[PDB]
Amino acid sequence: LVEMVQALYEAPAYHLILEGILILWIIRLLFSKTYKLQERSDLTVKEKEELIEEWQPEPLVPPVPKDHPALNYNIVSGPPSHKTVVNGKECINFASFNFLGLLDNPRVKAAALASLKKYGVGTCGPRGFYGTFDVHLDLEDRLAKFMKTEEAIIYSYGFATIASAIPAYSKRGDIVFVDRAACFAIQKGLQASRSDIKLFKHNDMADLERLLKEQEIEDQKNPRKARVTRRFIVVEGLYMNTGTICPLPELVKLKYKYKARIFLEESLSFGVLGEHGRGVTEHYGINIDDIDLISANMENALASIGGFCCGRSFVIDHQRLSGQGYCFSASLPPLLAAAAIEALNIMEENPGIFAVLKEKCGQIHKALQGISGLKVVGESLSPAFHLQLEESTGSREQDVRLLQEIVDQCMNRSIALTQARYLEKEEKCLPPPSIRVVVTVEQTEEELERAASTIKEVAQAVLL
Amino acid sequence: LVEMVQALYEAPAYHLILEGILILWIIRLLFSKTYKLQERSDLT
Amino acid sequence: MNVGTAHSEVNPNTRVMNSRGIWLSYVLAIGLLHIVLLSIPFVSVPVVWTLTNLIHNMGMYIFLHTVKGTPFETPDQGKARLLTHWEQMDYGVQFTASRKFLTITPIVLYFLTSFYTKYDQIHFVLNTVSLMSVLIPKLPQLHGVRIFGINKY
Amino acid sequence: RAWKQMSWFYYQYLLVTALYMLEPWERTVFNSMLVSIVGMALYTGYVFMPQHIMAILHYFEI
Amino acid sequence: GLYKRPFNEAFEETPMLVAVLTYVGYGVLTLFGYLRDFLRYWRIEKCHHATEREEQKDFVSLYQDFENFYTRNLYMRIRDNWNRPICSVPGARVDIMERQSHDYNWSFKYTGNIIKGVINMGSYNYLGFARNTGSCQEAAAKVLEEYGAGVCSTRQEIGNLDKHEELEELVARFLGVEAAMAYGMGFATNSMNIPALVGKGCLILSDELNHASLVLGARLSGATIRIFKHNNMQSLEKLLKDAIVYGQPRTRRPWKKILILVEGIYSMEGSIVRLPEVIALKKKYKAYLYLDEAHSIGALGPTGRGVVEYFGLDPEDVDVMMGTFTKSFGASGGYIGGKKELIDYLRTHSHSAVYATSLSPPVVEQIITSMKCIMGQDGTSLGKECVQQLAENTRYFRRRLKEMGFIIYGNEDSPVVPLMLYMPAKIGAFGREMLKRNIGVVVVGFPATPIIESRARFCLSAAHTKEILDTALKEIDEVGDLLQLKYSRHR
């Protein structure tokens, strides 16, 4: 003990160093349980050749059954608009997402031709260098002013917008609470970012509350990690797969109570909802600042290619350097930018088109009630809703075949409908097959009740 | 050379032992070309 | 500018130390520090050598073993957000010419400063403490481990 | 003439050491540190080391 | 594989002194950046960046501050070089809206005056189709008047038009493959058609210098990715042999598929891919080939049919041929060409077709008109003239630049010419000095490239004449004399 310590202290230095080295050797030996066998073997050249020969690759593409419903593409013999011509038959368009009828306005075409005379068709470069035109900055300023927000950023492709916006902010090790009935663009954006994804029930705040409280428990488990994880809630203003609106005020309250930012998608909502057509926020009266990021695409309402994101500069400015679809691709052609600017001018000039669209949506949604085999899933304010089989059959393929028979019999009677298309093996929550009905400010009253009557008669004829 | 050898001889013992240990560490490092990847995986 | 414009690497930080002329530049930086310390009038040669050793070791510890992450945003979604530079080097490959060189250099510097301080006990204690502080993290076993939860987040 | 040559050499000095990008007060800080270090080095070399570069400087002057 | 004509590429190595000096510069920048950050943190210096709103102060911070280190300290100092607005057609001469900043590039304010006549060497014109007047513009205007600005639905439902079908058949005839499909974005083409071809249990062999779109497409699929060295056929052999012999990583099972992603011309380096060798190994080891002819579809080849025509091989050897209309044809979009079964499967099981909006009618009309002009269907000789003029211009430019003593990368045939600056400050210096002499170039710095290699890329065109090239070459020589950019020991 003490005497041993004194004796060790009285002993020389190099001897004690050697004894310490031996002690370290012993402590290394005790924990060295790796029972290495000390053997090395390698393959021969002929064995490598035979292994090469035996391997057989699968074909690049699997054979197709050739009976795919999507194998036959509808061929439009002209512009897709009111009174279109599809498959050689005269029809009335009930499938194109053109809510405001801005596709065929002479003013929009005049603006597009004016910008075509000046710049041409192609930008020929990314926005990062010699691909930024004055029209791009003008359009971004117009989008910022229209939505009463500081900054906006435009992408040249609608799908890439949210799919590049989401990975820019959400990184590995974060938590995202996304709705179950989220569009495919949001799903691929959430796949690109390697964050942890938690899905809650469609338009249910109870499941969101439960998930948030479980996250709170996990935060209390380890505060240090909980201090470096960011929480996001990704929702859509008007869901495409269902046609139902989102409960914004409760989401805002949950955000401020549980410290999780909000990403909002307004693709259908952007140009149809609100007194001036600004989205679900104007419909509910929620302040614009309560939502961090609002994504949209100019393809549906504005009738032009591309998309955009809107928000405060603190949030938007990061996408100019982290958005892959923005950094590594050519910019939007000036033609489509000018078309979007003119569409914005027309939308600002007359705000009654949103009111007449709401009128027509309500009328057609009320009229389509009372079909034996068809149920109208959706809401009375969305321009696009669905028609689903009430008593579904045993298989999905028979259901899509029945719906396609209904669609064909409708087209033969000058009603142009379409059926919702999904990737069966890729969609997270595959929706049931459903016919899609889209309402415009161009469809007259008589056409509305005629389409309702035609769909009713065809449904009764087919499903009985 | 000779002066360096004399200076090393005049230096203390434990310091020279530590320097020798470091020399052995260096000679181990130089021939330790086994570029281990430090990964472990198992089947389910 | 943006990462990935001219190459396809998730983290250009890993191959920084394998670049051309980095070793010679690092050695010349050590020499410049030594000369700047030599220029000081009132200090003596053992003090100069001890100061160079301590300062170089402190710089190595701060840069290689303390600063964790990447100076630039990276498109692998923050895979190395919690790793220091030494762990990021060569994507975790434990031994490499760069790692061997970076481990060897402090030992040679230690031999030099020990000789030029004439084996004084105080200088021995200081140099040994700094050399151990540098060398201990270099061990392959000591990877992704923060003692008592220091520098974890 | 010679003033333009010195301006060109100063421009090359700025380009090489990446002082071209920095704001003027950062340039002032860097230049002051460099001048102080050089003056200290000259003082120490004169006081401590034997005057050997003095002969080379005199030969260059001649 | 063998070459019918010599294949000569030159990648001269960096001088040692230049490497030491660029490391000195980067170290100085890093130290001053740390001091900058300390001053900004202790509120001694005012911060010009925006801040989170007071209601979300207790929220977790949105960004990690260390990630933007280079943005504030290195990128912002020379930020004025890149996002330069223009107000005219991106021809051989472009108009740039000149801008000034007084807060050291944190915020830019536009002066009224506008630069005019700037020689354009940053735009991706290769055949000079970016013109505001011509036949293509007339056809585009006609289709715009008839059809409109854009389609409002996807291909599968109602958004398929006759224009898309005729464009696809024209592209299939142009390439020489059986069938082709068209998309509205070159980035989306890769990012949406690589996940469909391969999935979990497959292998992807990506080049060292692949584009971001190819990498993103590979990541979105669950396949395992292995990176081989840039144009190193020995490395490709080694990875192929190891993948075939040793199988899957955890449980030894044969790979379902092996896909090799390569490009025709790499924009930054300017090196043409060694296509005969890679096709040889593809056939020998029974792999699959994905070829990205974004830069070579119009620039390369005697008639402008890509690298498969430049080398002279058979298009049926390449399994998937991606391509982009933005560079050469002067309109946005993309395409994939291949056998009929491939195109049918992509028509049925591709993300872009199902969920994304189709192309615009004026854009497809412009592509159709330009592609008809190239193949001589209009009957004129304009198609061959641009293709031969581009080759003359690139050979002349590369020869004269190399004889001046600069360091140039890539093959002699590639229209893209990367000059090497090698130092962080010379990037901004070259950009500003070239702008002062009415020349527009593109400079690429550290985080994109390797650390020692910073460059400036010249993209040549058939619109450039001999006079314009002579003026640009004289200005480049003068600037290289000013900045001492001639690092070549050979000449």
Curated annotation (Swiss-Prot), chain A:
Q: How does it assemble?
A: Component of the serine palmitoyltransferase (SPT) complex, which is also composed of SPTLC2 or SPTLC3 and SPTSSA or SPTSSB. The heterodimer consisting of SPTLC1 and SPTLC2/SPTLC3 forms the catalytic core of the enzyme, while SPTSSA or SPTSSB subunits determine substrate specificity. SPT also interacts with ORMDL proteins, especially ORMDL3, which negatively regulate SPT activity in the presence of ceramides. Forms dimers of heterodimers with SPTLC2. Interacts with RTN4 (isoform B).
Q: Induction of this protein: by what?
A: Expression at protein level is highly increased in brains of patients with Alzheimer disease. No changes are observed at mRNA level.
Q: How does it sit in the membrane?
A: Single-pass membrane protein
The organism named in the record is Homo sapiens
Which residues are in coiled coils?
A: none
Where does this protein act, in terms of pathway? Lipid metabolism; sphingolipid metabolism
Concerning InterPro entries, the annotation shows: Aminotransferase_I/II_large, AON_synthase_class-II, PyrdxlP-dep_Trfase, PyrdxlP-dep_Trfase_major, PyrdxlP-dep_Trfase_small
Keyword Acyltransferase present in the record's keywords: the answer is yes
Effect annotated for changing R230W: In a breast cancer sample; somatic mutation
Names of required cofactors = pyridoxal 5'-phosphate
**Family recorded in the similarity comment:** Belongs to the class-II pyridoxal-phosphate-dependent aminotransferase family.
EC number(s) stated in the UniProt entry for this protein: 2.3.1.50
For this entry, the protein name equals Serine palmitoyltransferase 1
Question: What superkingdom heads the lineage?
Answer: Eukaryota
Tissues and organs where the protein is expressed, per its UniProt entry: Widely expressed. Not detected in small intestine.
Q: Which gene encodes it?
A: SPTLC1
Can you summarize the PTM annotation of this record?
Answer: Phosphorylation at Tyr-155 inhibits activity and promotes cell survival.
Q: Is Cell wall biogenesis/degradation one of the keywords UniProt gives this record?
A: no
UniProtKB/Swiss-Prot annotation, chain C:
Task: Choose any GO biological process term that the UniProt entry carries and state it.
Answer: positive regulation of protein localization to nucleus
One Pfam family recorded for the sequence: ORMDL
Localization annotation: Endoplasmic reticulum membrane
Q: How is it modified after translation?
A: When hydroxylated at Pro-137, ubiquitinated via 'Lys-48'-linkage, leading to proteasomal degradation. In endothelial cells, ORMDL3 proteasomal degradation is controlled by the sphingosine 1-phosphate receptor signaling pathway.
Intervals, Lumenal compartment:
118-121
GO (cellular component) term, any one: endoplasmic reticulum
Q: Where is this region: Important for ceramide level-sensing?
A: 1-17
Swapping F63R leads to an effect described as:
Impaired negative regulation of SPT complex activity in the presence of ceramides
Please describe the organ and tissue distribution of this protein's expression: Widely expressed. Expressed in adult and fetal heart, brain, lung, liver, skeletal muscle and kidney. Expressed in adult pancreas and placenta and in fetal spleen and thymus.
Xref: InterPro entries: ORMDL
Altering I22R: what's the impact? Impaired negative regulation of SPT complex activity in the presence of ceramides
Q: How does it assemble?
A: Ceramide-sensitive subunit of the serine palmitoyltransferase (SPT) complex, which is also composed of SPTLC1, SPTLC2/3 and SPTSSA/B.
User: Domain comment?
Assistant: Ceramides bind to ORMDL3 N-terminus and stabilize it in a conformation that physically restricts the accessibility of the substrates to their binding sites in the serine palmitoyltransferase (SPT) complex, hence inhibiting SPT catalytic activity. In the absence of ceramides, the N-terminus is flexible and permits substrate binding, thus liberating SPT from inhibition.
Per the record, the similarity remark reads:
Belongs to the ORM family.
Name it: ORM1-like protein 3
Q: Which organism is it from?
A: Homo sapiens
From Swiss-Prot, chain D:
Tell me if Endoplasmic reticulum is a UniProt keyword of this record.
Answer: yes
Q: Which residues lie on this side of the membrane: Lumenal?
A: 23-27
**InterPro entries associated with the record:** Ser_palmitoyltrfase_ssu-like, SPT_small_subunit
Q: What is the effect of changing T44I?
A: In SPG90A; likely pathogenic; results in increased sphingolipid biosynthetic process due to impaired down-regulation of serine palmitoyltransferase (SPT) complex activity by ORMDL3
Spell out where the chain crosses the membrane.
6-22, 28-50
- One GO term of the biological process aspect: protein localization
Q: Where is the signal peptide?
A: none
Q: Give the pathway annotation.
A: Lipid metabolism; sphingolipid metabolism
Marked site: Within the serine palmitoyltransferase (SPT) complex, defines the length of the acyl chain-binding pocket, determining the acyl-CoA substrate preference: M21
Q: Which residues lie on this side of the membrane: Cytoplasmic?
A: 51-62
Q: Which GO terms describe its molecular function?
A: serine C-palmitoyltransferase activity
Subunit structure, briefly? Component of the serine palmitoyltransferase (SPT) complex, which is composed of SPTLC1, SPTLC2 or SPTLC3 and SPTSSA or SPTSSB. The heterodimer consisting of SPTLC1 and SPTLC2/SPTLC3 forms the catalytic core of the enzyme, while SPTSSA or SPTSSB subunits determine substrate specificity. SPT also interacts with ORMDL proteins, especially ORMDL3, which negatively regulate SPT activity in the presence of ceramides. Interacts with MBOAT7; the interaction plays a role in MBOAT7 localization to mitochondria-associated membranes.
- Protein known as: Serine palmitoyltransferase small subunit A
From what organism does this protein derive? Homo sapiens
Q: Which gene encodes it?
A: SPTSSA
Curated annotation (Swiss-Prot), chain E:
SUPFAM superfamilies in the record: PLP-dependent transferases
Q: What is its EC number?
A: 2.3.1.50
For this chain, one GO molecular function annotation is: pyridoxal phosphate binding
Q: Please give the residue positions where the record annotates the modification N6-(pyridoxal phosphate)lysine.
A: K327
Effect ascribed to mutating V307M: In HSAN1C; partial loss of normal activity as measured by reduced formation of sphinganine; affects enzymatic affinity resulting in the accumulation of the alternative metabolite 1-deoxy-sphinganine
Activity regulation, free text:
SPT complex catalytic activity is negatively regulated by ORMDL proteins, including ORMDL3, in the presence of ceramides. This mechanism allows to maintain ceramide levels at sufficient concentrations for the production of complex sphingolipids, but which prevents the accumulation of ceramides to levels that trigger apoptosis.
Q: Which GO terms describe its biological process?
A: adipose tissue development; ceramide biosynthetic process; positive regulation of lipophagy; sphinganine biosynthetic process; sphingolipid biosynthetic process; sphingomyelin biosynthetic process; sphingosine biosynthetic process
The record's tissue-specificity note reads: Widely expressed.
The cofactor required is: pyridoxal 5'-phosphate
- Where can this protein be found? Endoplasmic reticulum membrane
Q: Which GO terms describe its cellular component?
A: endoplasmic reticulum membrane; serine palmitoyltransferase complex
Its annotated pathway reads: Lipid metabolism; sphingolipid metabolism
Which keywords does the record carry?
Answer: Acyltransferase, Disease variant, Endoplasmic reticulum, Lipid metabolism, Membrane, Neurodegeneration, Neuropathy, Pyridoxal phosphate, Sphingolipid metabolism, Transferase, Transmembrane, Transmembrane helix
Q: Could you identify this protein by its name?
A: Serine palmitoyltransferase 2
